[PDB]
Amino acid sequence: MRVEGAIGKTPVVRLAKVVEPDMAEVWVKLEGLNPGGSIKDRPAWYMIKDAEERGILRPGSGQVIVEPTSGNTGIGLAMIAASRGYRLILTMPAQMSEERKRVLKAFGAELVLTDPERRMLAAREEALRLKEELGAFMPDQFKNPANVRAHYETTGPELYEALEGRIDAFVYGSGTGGTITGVGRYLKERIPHVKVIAVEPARSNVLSGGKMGQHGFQGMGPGFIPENLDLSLLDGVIQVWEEDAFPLARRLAREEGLFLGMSSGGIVWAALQVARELGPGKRVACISPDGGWKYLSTPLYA
Amino acid sequence: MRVEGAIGKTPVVRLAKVVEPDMAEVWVKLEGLNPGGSIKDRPAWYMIKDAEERGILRPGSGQVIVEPTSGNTGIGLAMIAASRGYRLILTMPAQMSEERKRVLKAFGAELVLTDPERRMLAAREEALRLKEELGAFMPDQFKNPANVRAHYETTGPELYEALEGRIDAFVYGSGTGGTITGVGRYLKERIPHVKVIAVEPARSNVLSGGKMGQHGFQGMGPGFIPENLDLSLLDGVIQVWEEDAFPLARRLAREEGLFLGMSSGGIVWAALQVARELGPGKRVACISPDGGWKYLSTPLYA
Numbered sequence A, B: 001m002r003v004e005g006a007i008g009k010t011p012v013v014r015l016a017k018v019v020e021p022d023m024a025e026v027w028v029k030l031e032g033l034n035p036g037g038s039i040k041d042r043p044a045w046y047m048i049k050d051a052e053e054r055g056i057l058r059p060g061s062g063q064v065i066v067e068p069t070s071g072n073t074g075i076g077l078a079m080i081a082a083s084r085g086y087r088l089i090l091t092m093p094a095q096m097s098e099e100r101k102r103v104l105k106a107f108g109a110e111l112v113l114t115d116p117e118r119r120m121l122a123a124r125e126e127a128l129r130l131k132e133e134l135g136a137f138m139p140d141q142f143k144n145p146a147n148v149r150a151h152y153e154t155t156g157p158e159l160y161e162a163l164e165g166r167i168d169a170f171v172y173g174s175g176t177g178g179t180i181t182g183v184g185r186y187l188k189e190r191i192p193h194v195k196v197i198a199v200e201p202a203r204s205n206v207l208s209g210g211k212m213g214q215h216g217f218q219g220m221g222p223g224f225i226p227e228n229l230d231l232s233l234l235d236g237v238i239q240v241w242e243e244d245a246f247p248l249a250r251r252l253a254r255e256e257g258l259f260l261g262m263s264s265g266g267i268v269w270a271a272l273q274v275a276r277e278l279g280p281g282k283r284v285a286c287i288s289p290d291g292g293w294k295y296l297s298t299p300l301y302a
C-alpha cells in the first residue's frame, strides 16, 4: 500500500469536559491524523486520482500539476504528487511562513511566490499562466467536483458508520465547500431529518449575508461562496468569533488532550452551541480539519 | 471515546521507489499518525493507565507526575495528563525548541529546563529531585514494563494482523527498548523464524560494544542498555550513520510521499540492508516512530 492508501479512517472522539450537562453529545472526527496532517489529503488524492481516471494525468510521468494554495491543500497535493511521480508547483503570497515553505519543499514541491499585495488573485493569475505555458493540470479546489466526491465517498461513510447512523446534526466550518457538501449529501440521503449546519468567521460572514473580511480561522471562510458549496443542503449558518473560539481551543488541548487547529476551535465552538439547542438524547457530529502543530506561532498558542 | 482511545491502529505502507529490485518487500508502520504525533502515545497511556490500575493515580485528582524527557515521551504524557486531569511536570535541557515548549504548554504541562551541557544527565537528576520533594509519580520509561506491555498488546498485534502474519524480519531503532521488546516477543511467539533486528546510532553503538556518544537520531540510542530492552530477543544489531539515513529520509519524502522523522530515516535504512540480505519474496517490517513535522528546523530538512 502507498501513502494515499493510508488516507482516511480517522477516529472520532466524544467531548467530555468542554460540554455542559444538558448538551447533546458532541463528537469530533480528527482529520489531523491523515498522512499529510489534514483533511486535505482526501481532496488532494481525489482530484489527482480523478484526473488520472479521465486520462489527464499519467502516473510517474513527471507531468505538471499547478495550484494556487497557501494552506493544507498545498501539503496534501505535495504528498500525493511525490508519491505518484508528479511535478508540483504551488503559487502563493510571499508572506507565507518560512515554516510552511519548508514542509512543501520537503516533498519536492516547487514554490512560486506572488505579490503579497494582490494576494489570492495574483497567486491564481500566476497558476493559470503556468497552466497554459506548461499545459499542466490544475486541481482548482473550489470548483472541482472531485473535492466533494472525496467526502461523499470516504469522509461521510466513515462518520456515519463510526456513529452507527445516530446523527442529529452535522456541523462544519466551510472552506472549499467540499467537506460540508460531500458529508452533507451522504448523511442527508440516509438521515433526511439531519441538520447540516455551516460555520463561518463572524468577520467574513458571507453565508449569513455579511461581507468578506480578515479573520484568524485559517483554512475556512474563503470570503465568497465557492462552486463546490451546495447551499440547498444547509439548514443554518453559525458565525464564530476568534474571541470565543481560541479560548475554547485552549480548553480542548488542556482539558481533553485535543490539540487542534484554528478552524477546529471555531467549528467545535459552533458544534457546542448546536448541542445546547438539541439537548440530551441527540448527537452532534463535527470535524477537526487538522491539529495545532502548524499554528504554534499564532496567538492561539503563543 | 476519549483521546487515549483514539491511539493506535496506525497504517503500514510498502516502499516502492527507494528499494532495489533484488530486495525483499519493505513495510513501514506509521506511528506519526497517532493523536500525539508519535509512537510514544502508547507507552504514555499504558504507564499512566497501569498506575491508575494499581491505585497510584486517580483521574481528575490533579496528582503530580514528573518525568525527564526532551522528546516524544513528554508529548504523549502531556496529552494523557491533560485528558485525565493530572498535573505533569517535565524536565529537559534548556536548549529545547521554542515551538516544542509551546506544544507541551498547550497541553498544560509544566517545564523545568536544566543544564544544556550535561544533557539528559541533568534532567534525570532534576526529575528525581522533584519526585523526592513533591512525592510525585514518575513513569520511568526506561524501566517501566508497562512501556513494553503497550507494544506487546497493541503495536505487535496490529503489525502481525496487518501483514497476514507474514514477516521474515522486524527492524527497529531502540530507544527505551519497549517497542522492539514488546513487538519482538509478540512476533517471536507466532513466527518461529522471524528475525528481530535492533538498530542503533553508529556514534553511540552501546549494543555493538562501542561507547555512548552524541548523535542526531532523536528518540533512539539512549547511550546505554535500558531495563526494558530484552537482549535475548535480538538476532542482530545494525549500526546507522546520519550521513546515510538523512539522505534516504529526504528520498522517502520526495519519492514515496513519506515525510518521516530522523529516527525513521535510520530505521528504514537498516531495513533496506536487511531487505537486500533476505532477497525478493521475503517481507521486512519496521516502524516509523514519528513524522517529519518536528524536524523541519534540523539539518535533516532545513
Ligand SMILES: *Cc1c(COP(=O)(O)O)cnc(C)c1O
Binding pocket: A038, A039, A040, A071, A072, A073, A173, A174, A175, A176, A177, A178, A179, A180, A218, A219, A220, A261, A263, A264, A289, A290
Ligand atoms: C480545507 C480546510 C477547511 C475546510 O474544508 P473544505 O472541505 O475545504 O470546506 C477547514 N480548515 C482547514 C484547516 C482546512 O485546511
Ligand SMILES: *Cc1c(COP(=O)(O)O)cnc(C)c1O
Binding pocket: B038, B039, B040, B071, B072, B073, B173, B174, B175, B176, B177, B178, B179, B180, B218, B219, B220, B261, B263, B264, B289, B290
Ligand atoms: C521513542 C522513540 C523511538 C524508540 O522507541 P522505544 O519504544 O522507546 O524503543 C525512536 N524514535 C523516536 C522519534 C521516538 O520518540
Ligand SMILES: CC(=O)CCCC(=O)O
Binding pocket: A040, A068, A069, A070, A071, A072, A073, A074, A174, A175, A176, A218, A219, A220, A221, A222, A223
Ligand atoms: C477557505 C480557504 O481559505 C481554503 C483554503 C484551502 C487551501 O488552500 O488549503
Ligand SMILES: CC(=O)CCCC(=O)O
Binding pocket: B068, B069, B070, B071, B072, B073, B074, B174, B175, B176, B218, B219, B220, B221, B222, B223
Ligand atoms: C532513548 C531515547 O533517546 C529516548 C527518548 C524517549 C523520550 O522521548 O523521552
